[PDB]
Unconditional design. Structure first.
Length: 50
RNA sequence: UGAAACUGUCCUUAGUGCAGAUCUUGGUGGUAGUAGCAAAUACUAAGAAGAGGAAAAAAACAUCUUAGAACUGAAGAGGAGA
């Protein structure tokens, strides 16, 4: 569970959803030790639902 | 180095000697990898082509298709003329 409100607290509004994508890509790099991270279509759309 | 013209002496001739003219023309420095590349709400994910996203996150990736999110808001960032 990524507590995203910790990362996107007091972030500029127009750079919230794009920065949410970056944070997830960082956690995947720091966990699976890989660099080629491929988001799913469903995950992208949920971030942009709001 | 250069590869086909040139030199010394005597008279004669002069468009004859440059550090300046905010001199003329051309080339080039410090400034300096500095000031900047900040009006017009905004981009993200998957795939394709391509030498052109690699990697100890090098945090950013132009073009086209799909999906999401959006802007001009119809006296428009629409469709047409002089």
């Amino acid at each position: 569970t990524i507590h995203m409100h910790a990362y996107l607290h007091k972030e500029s509004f127009k750079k919230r959803a794009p920065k949410a994508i970056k944070i997830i890509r960082f956690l995947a790099i720091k966990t699976m030790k890989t660099h080629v991270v491929k988001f799913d279509m469903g995950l992208n759309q949920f971030i942009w639902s709001q």
